[PDB]
Design a binder for this molecule. Sequence first.
Ligand code: ADP
Ligand code: ADP
Lengths: 310, 310, 310, 310
Amino acid sequence: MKVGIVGSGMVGSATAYALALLGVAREVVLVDLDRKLAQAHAEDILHATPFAHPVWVWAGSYGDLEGARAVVLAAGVAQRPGETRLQLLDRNAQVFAQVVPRVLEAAPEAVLLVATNPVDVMTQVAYALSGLPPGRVVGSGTILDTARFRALLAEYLRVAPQSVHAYVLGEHGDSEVLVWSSAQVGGVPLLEFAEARGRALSPEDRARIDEGVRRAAYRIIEGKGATYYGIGAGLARLVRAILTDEKGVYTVSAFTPEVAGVLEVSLSLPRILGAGGVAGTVYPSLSPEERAALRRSAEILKEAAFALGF
Amino acid sequence: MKVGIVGSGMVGSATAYALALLGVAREVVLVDLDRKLAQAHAEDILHATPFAHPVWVWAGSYGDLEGARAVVLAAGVAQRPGETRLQLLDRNAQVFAQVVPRVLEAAPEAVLLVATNPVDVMTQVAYALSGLPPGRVVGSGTILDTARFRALLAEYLRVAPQSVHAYVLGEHGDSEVLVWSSAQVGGVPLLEFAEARGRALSPEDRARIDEGVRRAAYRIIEGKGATYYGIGAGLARLVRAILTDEKGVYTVSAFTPEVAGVLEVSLSLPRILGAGGVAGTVYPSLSPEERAALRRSAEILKEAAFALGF
Amino acid sequence: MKVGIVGSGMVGSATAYALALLGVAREVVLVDLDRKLAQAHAEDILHATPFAHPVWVWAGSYGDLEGARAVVLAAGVAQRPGETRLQLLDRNAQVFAQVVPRVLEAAPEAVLLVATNPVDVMTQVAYALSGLPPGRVVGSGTILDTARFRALLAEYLRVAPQSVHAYVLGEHGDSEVLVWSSAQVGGVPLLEFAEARGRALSPEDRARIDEGVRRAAYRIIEGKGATYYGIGAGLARLVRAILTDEKGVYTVSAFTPEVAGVLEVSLSLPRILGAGGVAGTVYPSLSPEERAALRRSAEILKEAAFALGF
Amino acid sequence: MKVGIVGSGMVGSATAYALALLGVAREVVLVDLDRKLAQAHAEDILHATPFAHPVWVWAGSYGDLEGARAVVLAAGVAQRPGETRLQLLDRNAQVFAQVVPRVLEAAPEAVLLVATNPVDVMTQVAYALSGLPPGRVVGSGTILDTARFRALLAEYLRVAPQSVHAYVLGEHGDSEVLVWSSAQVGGVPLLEFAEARGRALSPEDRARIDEGVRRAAYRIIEGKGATYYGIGAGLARLVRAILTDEKGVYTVSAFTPEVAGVLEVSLSLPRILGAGGVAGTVYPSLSPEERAALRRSAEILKEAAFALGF
Ligand SMILES: Nc1ncnc2c1ncn2[C@@H]1O[C@H](COP(=O)(O)OP(=O)(O)O)[C@@H](O)[C@H]1O
Ligand SMILES: Nc1ncnc2c1ncn2[C@@H]1O[C@H](COP(=O)(O)OP(=O)(O)O)[C@@H](O)[C@H]1O
């Protein structure tokens, strides 16, 4: 079935591309302020379809979003020199104040998947503006970082990543929490199963993995100036979760009534994703340190929200 | 790359078919005492390939197994009226005494995947006859039962099966142990996460699921007289593990030095499967009851082995 | 979406398996006179699903076919040795007289895919009994044979089978016509492009290929006593055509108002397959010999029909 | 199963992405002058892998290309506005004079897949600098254009694109030739099968389709400023042809001893692609007009070559 993407820039277009190569959705509609850009991306992708899957990819207006199961909000403004993360945040909040109602007008049944950075806050803004139930608005959140964590662990232990269950929670960004505490492999505690293999996870190792997960976006942005590909494919996977009513577990950003003592904040927790959006929350055990860090992350997300008027 | 299958009957042929439809291997070689049968299965499957994948499926002799990474041993005798499980076991043991050296002569260079029932014992016999390291001989074991467990649980909790970690261990058969103890969903304890939805599992629920897992084979055999399809696809997935050096976790039957107090027995535990066969064992927490049941299962498998002279 | 299968024997069950491993349809319903058989096949396949795709496979009754896009008719009687092809044919015609209305009662919108041999005649019987438009009733026909032809040619010329366009037409059976005349590779005449490579197709080559195609079914039946796997996957591919509204070209059996001079007969011609069944016919150039042979095939199919009262 | 990509920009990175999402290769090496760029693209894509396939994607130097079956040459300089197509071409030719010997030093076994525009000429330059046999150097050529032709025809006819054989030949660019003449559907002449469905192609429809093909790249570049996605996936499909020794037919650019009267020129013709590169050419029937247009295209490609010194 059908998926909308509003915001046709690098992230939007990469998401479309991934949807198309993976054969997730039958239909993909690109909507962008610059009409010509969306059309160009659409046609470029359309060129690729014959080498993967019969996906109808096209550019249109908000109205064309009718019936989309999900709409990804990838929109946002040109970064501007000598402008505080705050001013940018403001201009984007304004973009979303345009976009959300219009998307909802056409496709009142859709789930909104929020892309645009910073993702937790934008997720808050969209939840606020949508007047939908909280679970209908999902931010992409920490999924890439969680996946990378699982990957580095997998690689350390010489085990399939699929057998590694570990989480990254909180703000997607520097304050994100890697939960080492309750992490497991094959359903047994990580660090135990570390001895149980020949591989005791020195704090130095812990630190090496942390750098690996934490600084990946920074490096990507330093070398190429933006991230698209990873998130494009993550968004694709979430869109697939939504369309197949998978009810699978992903660490995503949503409005949470209370987390670690903080009230009414959007951030990433493991959540059950399916056709109506998120349908349930999974609480892994946190150590006191991790809980404290989560609490901090949430606090700071919450003050951001407040500073912006959300 | 290349996979051998010895014994061409319903299980062997179904395994080949699954290999072929899933596109696991490049090449599948069927070897059977009845040459015409293997050739007929081969060509039937060959007919199917154009509707899935370019897989070369053909019938040959043991020598044709050269270079196969894995060889599935599906061989075994016609069951015969009012013959004890013992006499059958005996005749099969002798089949394997033929087959094993012949397979290893041609493909000294292979992992043996044991199909033939009863699977744990047959796995013991093959381990014994091979003189290979224990991990090069793997029985299909409890995988179907573990997967169905995961499935029934998944279905109870309204959650994707992928997010359910639960095990079935021991003898593949009536003994088998369902480990409810350490079972989890999304990396958190099952029963906890039961109340953590709309969930609490009543003992009659646990019993309904237990019937579901455990007596499945019996029902299948009562209706159609044999099981092939499930194990065909299970075998396929293990073969894929082996060929891709996946190092993933499966509950499979192998020779284990000690389990739950019993010495030198073959049975199903979660094991790490990869290119050289099993490469490590994962020990989930067992409750005292579960541990006792496991101990029992092992004991009985071990006496079977002994009775047969293994 | 949803597919029905009526008759649960080797062909039915294999088709179900294939549908499931290939992830064609979300739902597969097995309906068989012997309820226990259908249920056992269903559960055996269900065991396989976790190793491929989330397909819901279950056994039920005709009423449970509601909403299926396609229903495969695989039913039919136990053979009896020394019983003429005619009496068998009769026995089956009566089976279909039982099945067809019942299938159309529950799922009046469905396309009927006719498996049961001899397939052309059964296809006629089903067309007659259905009172549907002709294109709603499609026999599996010559597809396996056409694919095999393409394959052997592909292998002769050292070229991908995808590039080879060649047909097998008429009765599925001995009298089938291999069209060598208009056969091409990469859109250019076969025999020409034969000199255009290093291989000029001697008549004994032609003959070798002919043997390869026409007698395959015979060999399979001599070795294993029945064919299932190939047609299982073919049926699967046709089902996928119908459910995706592929409008792709397959040589299938359907009621044809006139072919090569013969009137109102069912046989295999290249036809465009899609959501409403066949939607158009493609006429390849035939040589006078080929046309004659086709005419013969049709004549004999038609007299068969008449002898049976169709 | 390893693939190199030299030059890291939009086309290179998109090709890597596509390789990775489609699960073509086990390993993808990015090599770019700007080391940081390659690394960033690599890591961004790596982030995506967990949502599709276990592909190892990394950035390294030419030496790291050892053992690659194919290496895509995507490199090429920044376009300066004002600058004639000739100066650009000169700058690119020098880039290739650096790159080719380096790639062949590390991976003397590989097959060069030429990306960089203008593709036919760059393909010539690479062939010349390689000193390899002609079929070892393959340009991406007209593939996207051929596929869109087939697509628009398929759409007109309401038939699956897979059943449409039609070609685009010559210079990838404005002077490319659509062969309407020998085009067929289901192995029968297009225009005939046009009346054979209801609705023949009118000079107006032929023109509508022509615009659709020939001008696509222009529109894409006017809207987004570059094309990547389509060719990324095309390149991917070609790489898959090479690695699976597919021997399939693609219209690609290679050095051709003679075409339509012109001598020693590189351009797109249907060619048989496999593990050693191209392995044979397929000559479709051309009408005199088509013939003439091809000869023109070739002439102009050849003068381009000469002007540059090739
Ligand atoms: N009000 C709006 N409605 C729709 N699209 C918008 C609006 N404002 C900005 N956009 C689009 O959002 C896109 C952002 O793309 P880009 O700057 O690459 O950021 P990202 O990398 O997050 O996609 C731009 O292409 C712009 O056209
Ligand atoms: N000594 C042997 N060597 C090779 N193949 C054998 C030998 N003994 C039996 N077989 C084959 O093993 C197959 C047994 O499979 P079958 O009894 O049909 O169902 P299952 O797959 O459950 O065993 C038979 O088809 C037979 O041809």
